[PDB]
Symmetry: D2
Subunit: 458 residues, 4 copies
Amino acid sequence: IAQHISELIGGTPLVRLNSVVPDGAGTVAAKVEYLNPGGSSKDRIAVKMIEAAEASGQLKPGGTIVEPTSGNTGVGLALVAQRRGYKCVFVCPDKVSEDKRNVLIAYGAEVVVCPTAVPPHDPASYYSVSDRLVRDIDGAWKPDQYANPEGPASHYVTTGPEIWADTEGKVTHFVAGIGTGGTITGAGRYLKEVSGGRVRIVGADPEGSVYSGGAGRPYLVEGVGEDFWPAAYDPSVPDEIIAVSDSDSFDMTRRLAREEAMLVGGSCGMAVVAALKVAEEAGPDALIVVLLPDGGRGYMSKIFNDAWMSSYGFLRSRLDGSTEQSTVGDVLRRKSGALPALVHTHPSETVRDAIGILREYGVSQMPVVGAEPPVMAGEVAGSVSERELLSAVFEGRAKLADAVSAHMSPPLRMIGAGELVSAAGKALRDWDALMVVEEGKPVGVITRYDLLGFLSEG
Amino acid sequence: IAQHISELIGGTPLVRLNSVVPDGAGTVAAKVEYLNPGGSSKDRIAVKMIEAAEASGQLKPGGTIVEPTSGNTGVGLALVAQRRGYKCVFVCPDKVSEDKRNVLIAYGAEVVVCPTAVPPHDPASYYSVSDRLVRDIDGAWKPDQYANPEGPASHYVTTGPEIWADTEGKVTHFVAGIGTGGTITGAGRYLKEVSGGRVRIVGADPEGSVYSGGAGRPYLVEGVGEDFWPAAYDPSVPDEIIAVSDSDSFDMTRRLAREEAMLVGGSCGMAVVAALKVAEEAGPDALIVVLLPDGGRGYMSKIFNDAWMSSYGFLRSRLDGSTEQSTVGDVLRRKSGALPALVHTHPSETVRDAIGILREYGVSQMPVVGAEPPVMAGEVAGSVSERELLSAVFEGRAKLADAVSAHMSPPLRMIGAGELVSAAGKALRDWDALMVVEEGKPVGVITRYDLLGFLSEG
Amino acid sequence: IAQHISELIGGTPLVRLNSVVPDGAGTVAAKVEYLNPGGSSKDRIAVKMIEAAEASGQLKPGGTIVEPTSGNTGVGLALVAQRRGYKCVFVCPDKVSEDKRNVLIAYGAEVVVCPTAVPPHDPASYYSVSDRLVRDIDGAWKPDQYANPEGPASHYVTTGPEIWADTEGKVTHFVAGIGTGGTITGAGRYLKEVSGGRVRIVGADPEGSVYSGGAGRPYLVEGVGEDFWPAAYDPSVPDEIIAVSDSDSFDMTRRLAREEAMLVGGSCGMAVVAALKVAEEAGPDALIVVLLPDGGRGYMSKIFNDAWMSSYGFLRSRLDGSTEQSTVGDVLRRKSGALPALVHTHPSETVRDAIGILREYGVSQMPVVGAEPPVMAGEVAGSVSERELLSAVFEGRAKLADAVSAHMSPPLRMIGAGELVSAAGKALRDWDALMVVEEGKPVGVITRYDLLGFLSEG
Amino acid sequence: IAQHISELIGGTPLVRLNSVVPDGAGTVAAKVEYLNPGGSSKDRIAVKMIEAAEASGQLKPGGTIVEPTSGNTGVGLALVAQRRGYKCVFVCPDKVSEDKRNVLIAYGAEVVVCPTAVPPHDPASYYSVSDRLVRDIDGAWKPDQYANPEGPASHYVTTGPEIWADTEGKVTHFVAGIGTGGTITGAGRYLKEVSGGRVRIVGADPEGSVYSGGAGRPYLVEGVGEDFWPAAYDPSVPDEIIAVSDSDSFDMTRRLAREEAMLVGGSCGMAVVAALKVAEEAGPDALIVVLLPDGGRGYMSKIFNDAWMSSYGFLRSRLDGSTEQSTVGDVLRRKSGALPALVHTHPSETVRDAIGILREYGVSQMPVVGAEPPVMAGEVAGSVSERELLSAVFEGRAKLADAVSAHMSPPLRMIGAGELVSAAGKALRDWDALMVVEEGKPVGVITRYDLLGFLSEG
Ligand SMILES: *Cc1c(COP(=O)(O)O)cnc(C)c1O
Ligand SMILES: *Cc1c(COP(=O)(O)O)cnc(C)c1O
Ligand SMILES: *Cc1c(COP(=O)(O)O)cnc(C)c1O
Ligand SMILES: *Cc1c(COP(=O)(O)O)cnc(C)c1O
C-alpha cells in the first residue's frame, strides 16, 4: 500500500512498437512514460527537485513554490508539493488553454496569468513577474527547471537504470526528444558511463531550433524546442541531433495512436520519427529505446482535431477515412445549403450602388450580369471588386455617380460546384476569387478568404 | 364651387425669384407649377389626354388605363380617371421608392411591379409587360405619354396662354426643363406663333443626355433626361439646349428652397440654373419665365438629406450650418465612442493566427506591435493586411505556420484623431488605409471602405 | 407676377365631395386648403401674425422668431419670415419625425430639439426652453400661436369671406376641426356676424379631448386636440362640438383619398366625418362647408401605411384589395419560408437542459415530444414554458437536475398552418400561445408576442 | 519488454487516502485504477472478453466488433482489438461529447452516431441500430457488456487477487461503485470465497437508481447508475448498497483531486464518499479498499468547470478561492461594463409604443419613469411587463392606442448594485424581477432569466 500518490512515480514500462517501424530493421522499444501518476515524464524531475529543497534547507517548511510553468512541470510540481503541503503558485502565459491551467488549479495550484508574446526580459512577460513574486512572497523557491542540475540528475538516477535494466544491458541507441534538456543529458550520460561508449545517444529536435543549428522559430509541438541554450543541457552528450519537421511529427503521433494503441503527444511523435530514421543506419540487432514523454489526452482537440490540424497547412488525411468528400459548393452552404441570390449588379447601375450592395452583403466581389433574374448562362458582363471600385473612386478616376460599366474589370474565371475543395485550392492558387457555375448558371463566388475560412472550421 | 378636384388643374401662379439671380440682370419669373391639385405639372397633359380618349371614342366607358408610370404622370392620371371612374393600373419599375407608389395606390391605382435594369425590349422590363397587359385586359388604353400629340397640345393650349397673359405679351425668353419633351415643345411653339420669333425658347437638359448631344447616362434627377428621341418632341422648337450638371442642379434646388421659399425638386433646380445662365447673355429688360414643374416634398429624403446627397459625391455644404464638425476619430466611434482596443498582432505570432484575428474581428488591416499592451508610442513593428497574407499563403510564399515577422509589410502612415474627415479623405486619396495616432498612441486604422461607409450614413 | 411666394397664400378653392356623402343628403363642399404655397392652412395665420409684429413694432428688423413648433405652423412661419429676412429658430419635441423637421430646416429654420413626454412646465419640455431662448436671444418674438388674437383674427378676415363668397351667402353650416382653436372661432364669428344666427357653426374634436368634455388623452391625429383651454378659443362660438374617434377619422381620410381624389391628412378626415354626421340632421338644401386644413403628403408613411395603421389596432382593410391573404404559417417564415426545426425537449432531459434550449433559441415555449425526430403526429407529451420553469426552479419546487417530465405543463392547443392570421388572433385571444399543426405534424408555436410583432411589420 | 501496449493492463497500484477520511477512523486504501494503459478500469473486462471470442471461436479472425459504447469500454475494446487487428465499429448516443468519441476514433474505431433520448427498443436508439449492424456485417460479435459473464469473471480473476494480495489478506470491507455491475460482483465474490464471510462488500449507487431501491432518473455521473437490472449483476453479493447524491459525489471528486493529488472522475467521488461513510460504522483497525475506476482528465471541462458545475445547482465553492466576488451590477455588464442605459417608458406613451420598446430592446420588463432623463431618484411611476401588456391587449382590456398609465402594474422592488449575486438569488426567490438602484438612481432590471443565464456562463 503506497503512502501517497506521488510514490508511484517511476518504473514506467518499456513497450515495443511493432507496426510503424518498417520491415528489416532493428527493434524499437518505446519507453511509454505517460503512465506516471502525474501524466507526463516531468514527474521524475519534479520529485528530485523537491527533495533538494528539503535537504539543502533552501525551501523552509510552509514555503511557497513559484514557477513560470509550461503545463506539464506544473502538474508534477503540484502533485508532489501537495503531498508535502507546500503552497504552489504558478505564473503562466495566456497562450496556455483553459483546460490545461484548469487542471493545474484542480491540483491545488494558484495560477496567475500574464500577457504573452512580450519580451521575456520585460515586466510583462512571466519571467520578470515570477522573479517579482519570488521577491515579494516569503520562503519562495523558484525551482528554475532550466538551470537546475537536479533536473538532469533525477533522470540520471531513475531513467537510465530503467532503460539499462528493462533491456538487460543491451541497447544500441537511445533517441529522446531534447527540449529544455534534461532527458537526453541525464539519460545518455549514464548509458555511456555504464556502457563505455557503445550506446550512441541521439536527440530529436523540432526543425529550425537552436539545437538543430537553426535560428528561432514559433514552436507548435508543446515541450521540445528552445530559443536559447539552457544552463542545464551539456551539449557534449548527444551524438547526433536529428531535427524533424512539425507536420511529420504530428502525422507520426496520429499514425502511432492509430497503429500502436498509444495516445502520445507531439514530442512523442517527433521522438518516434527521429528513431524510425536512426533505425535505418543501424541494421538488424539494433535496440532503439525511444522516450515517449507525454500522454496525448490534453491534445485531443489540438492535434487529433481535423479542423485545427487543417488550419496550419497540415492534415495529410482525416482520422476516420476518405479524404475530401466536401466539394466547393458546400463552401457556399454556410446558410445550411442555402446559396443566396448571387449578389449581382448590372452594367447600368451606379458605382455608388455597386459599392452599396458590396457593403450591405459583406461580399467583396460581384459579377455584373445583364439580367437581374439570377439565371444567366455564363454570360455575365463583368466583375466588380469592392477594392477596385474604392480605388477608382478615391483616386478621381470614377465619379460616385458614373455608370458601373465604365469601371468594371474583366470577368472572373469559373469552376464547377460539384468539384472537390482541393481543386478549389489548386485553382485559387493563381487568381483572387472565382465564380462557381453550377450546371450552367452561376451561383456565387468563392474567394481565398472564404475557402481558407472554411478549411479552418470543417 | 368646383365640381371635382380635377377642375382646379391650371392657371398656376407666376412668382418671381429675387434673391438667386445676381444683380444687374433681367427679371426671372418662376412659373411655380406645384400648386396643381395633383402636385406636379403633369396634371395638365393628363387632363387633355383623358379628354381625347373620350372624344375619339378610343376609351370605352368602364375601360382600364394601363401605363408604365414614372411617378408624376401616375398621380395626375389617377386623380382624373378617378373622377371619370376608369380603373387605372400601372406597371412600375422597382426603382421607385415605397412612398411614391404608395401614393400612387392611395389614389386608387393598381400598381404591378416588375424588375428593372433589364433591357426595355425584353419581357422583364415594364414596357413589354405594359403591352401584355394592354393585350389581355379589355378596353385598355395605353396613353403612351412619349408618343402622344395630345401631350404637347395640352401645354400648347393651357401653358403658353398663361405665360403670355400673366406677363402681358412681354417675355424675352422661356427656359424649361426638357424631359420626355412636352413642356418646351407645346409652350415654345405657341410663344413663337404669338410673338413672331421674338421669345427665344431655351431648354435645359441634364449633362450628358441625348438632347444635349451626348450619349446615354444613369440619370438621378427624376423626370428630365432620356436615352432616345421621343416621338413627341419636335427638335426644331428649342433654340438652345443648355445642358447642366447634376451636382449643380441639386445645389440650385437646395439654395432655391432656402433663399426663395420654394420646395422645388431636381428638374426645378436644373431649369432654374439654366435660366440664371441664359439670363446673362440677355442684359437688362429681360423676362425669363422658368417652368418649375414639380414640388419638392417627395424628394424630402432624396436631395434634402445630407446622407444621400453625400453618398453620391455631392453636398457642398450642410443644410443647417457649419461644414464638417465630423473629425476622423468619430469614424472609430461606431460602438458609441468606444474605440475597440486596437486589434493587433506581434512579430512572433503565426501567420495562421494573424489571419485568424483578421477574420474574427472583421477588420482588414492590423498593426503588428511589439507589446500586447495597447500603449505603443508610434513604434509599431509593421502592418499585416489580410489580402497580402492570403496571397502569400495561397502562393506558397509563406507556410501557414511561418512567423508573421517574415511576411509583414511596412508600417501604414498615421493621421491625427482630432482631424476633420475631409483631411482623412485627402489623405486616403493616396494610400489604402492609415492608423489614427491619438495623442501619441495608435487607436485603430481608418480605411477607404470605412470612411466611404461612414459618409453614406452620417 | 407675384412678388414673393408668400403672396399666393389665400383664396384657396372650394370643391365639393360627391361620393362619400350618402344619397338624399345636403351638399358638402370641402374647402380644400392644402393648395396654399406653405402646404397647410396655418399659412393664413402665419402671415397675419408676422404683420402684427411689424405694425406693433414688437419685432425689430433683423430679429429672430422663436416658437415651439408643431410641424405646420413652422412651415408657414419659415416661408414668410424668409421673405422678410427674419432669422427663425424653432424648438421641437423629438416626437416629430425626421422628414418633418428636415423640411422645417430646408426652408431656412434652425430647429433645436429637446426631449419629450416631460412635463411642459419643467426645464426639459420645449415650452420652458422656448422661454429661455426668448430671454437669451435679442429681438426675439415668441408668436405664441395659442394665446394670440391675431391668430383667429386672420381667419376672421380671410377665411370667412372666402366661405361666404364662394357660396354666395348660402351656407347652412360650417364644420371645421377644432385644434388650438382659431379656424372655428375666427370663421364662425364672421359667418354669424354676416348671417345673423343662421349658419350653425359645428366643431369636430378627437374623441376624449378637453373640448369634447372628456379628460386628457394621447393624441394621434396631428394637429387637432388639446389638454387645456387655449387662451385664443372663445368657447361661445361653436354650437355643437361633435367628437369623433381616431379609427373613424383615419378610415375617413383613407376613403376620402380613394373616392374623392384628395390627399387630406388626419384632421381632414375627422372634419369630414363630423360633417357627414351633421349632414343628416340637416335635410335637403343644406350646404356644409368643411375645412380640410392639411395635405396628406407628410402622412404618406403614417396613415397610408398598412403596417403602422395595423400596429395601433386599426386598418379595417388594406389599400389595394383583398383583406388577409397571409395565413398563420407565414408568421413562422421569418427565415424566408424556413420553418425553424421545431425546438423541442423530451420527457427525460434535464430541467437545466430545457432552460438551456429555451435560452439558446430565443423561443419562450417548447413542446416536449417523445421522439427527437420532428415528425410526431400530434402526440407531444407536454409543453414547457420558460417562465414556468424558471419559477419552479427559483422557488425550490424543482431542482435544476430533476427530469423535465415532473414539471411540464399540459399540452398547448393547436391551430392549422393554412389558416388566416385573423383566426390566429381570435384563437390567441384566449390562450398564451399555440402550436401550428401543419397537415398532421407540428411545425412550431405561434405566440401573442410573435403575432403582434408580425402585424406591426407586414 | 512488453510485446504490446495492452499487456500492461493490470496490477494497478493501491494507494491510501490520508487527508479526506476524518481522524479516529480506519484505513482507507484507494485502489487507483486510472493507471491502466487504456485510462480506465474497463480495460480489465475488455481483455477478458476478447479472449473469450478467440477461445469460444465466436469471433472469427478478421471479424468486426460492434458495440453500443459508453465512452470507457470503447477505449479498452479499441486498444485491444487493435492489437489483434479486429475492425471495431461503435454506435454512440449523441449525448457523448466530441472529445470522447474523437478519442474513440483516434484509436482506430469507427463510430456511427444516432439520435438519443428515444426509447431504447425503437429503431432510433442505438440498441436496435447495434443489432441491425450485427445482422448486416459479417463476423460481427456484439460483446454485450451488460449480459456477459466474462465481464464479472475478469474482475474475479484479476481484481480480487490484487486487492487480496496488496493488503496481505487483511481487508475488512470493499466498497466500489456499482454501475453496470461487474466490479462489485466479480470482486466481492472472490473476497468472500477467500475470506469466508469476513470482508463485507459494500456498493455505492447514485441517489435514486434501481439498485438503491428508487425508480429511474436522469443520470449525470458518467458510468454508475442504471434503469434496469443487468443480466450480469448477481444482487446477492453486495451486503449494503449505500446510495449517494450527485452534488456530494461531485464535491468529493473535486476535494479528492485537491487534497489527495488524484484526478478521479464522478463515480470515483461517489465511491469515495460511500467509503468515508461506511468507514464510520467500522471503528479502528478497518481497511476499506475503494475502487476508483476512472481518471478525471476527460471531465476536466465537465465537473472541474465552475460554469457547468454551477448551471446544475451545484458548486458549493470555486476551485481557486473566494466565493462570490461578482456582484449583481456585473450581471448588467454584458456589454463590457456598459449598462445599455435604462430602457424606459413614460405615463403618457402609448401601449403600442411600450410594446415596441420592449420588442426592440429584447428586455421583458421596463420601469415607467416620469422623466426621459435617466436620472430618476427612485421615483419611477410604475412598471410595464411585456407579458402583462400583451395579455391586456389581446383580451380587449386595453386598446393598442390607450395611454400606458392606465395599464401599468405596481413598481418592482429594488436591490443594490454592489450586492453579491447570492443576495440577488435570495431576492428573486420571491419576485419575478427587480431593478438595481445604483447609489440612488436605477440602472436597469435584473430578472430570473438573466441571473440564471449569467450563472451558467461565469
Ligand atoms: C518536458 C518535455 C519533454 C522533455 O524535455 P527535456 O528537455 O528532456 O527536459 C519532451 N516533450 C514534452 C512534451 C515535454 O513536456
Ligand atoms: C414631366 C417632368 C418634367 C417635364 O417633362 P416634359 O419633357 O416637359 O414632358 C420636368 N421635370 C419633372 C420632374 C417632370 O416629372
Ligand atoms: C392647425 C391645424 C388644424 C386647425 O387648428 P386650429 O385650432 O383651427 O388653429 C387642424 N388640423 C391640423 C392638422 C392642423 O395643423
Ligand atoms: C464502468 C464504470 C464503473 C464500474 O462499472 P461496473 O458496474 O463495475 O461494471 C464505475 N465508474 C465508471 C465511470 C465506469 O465507467
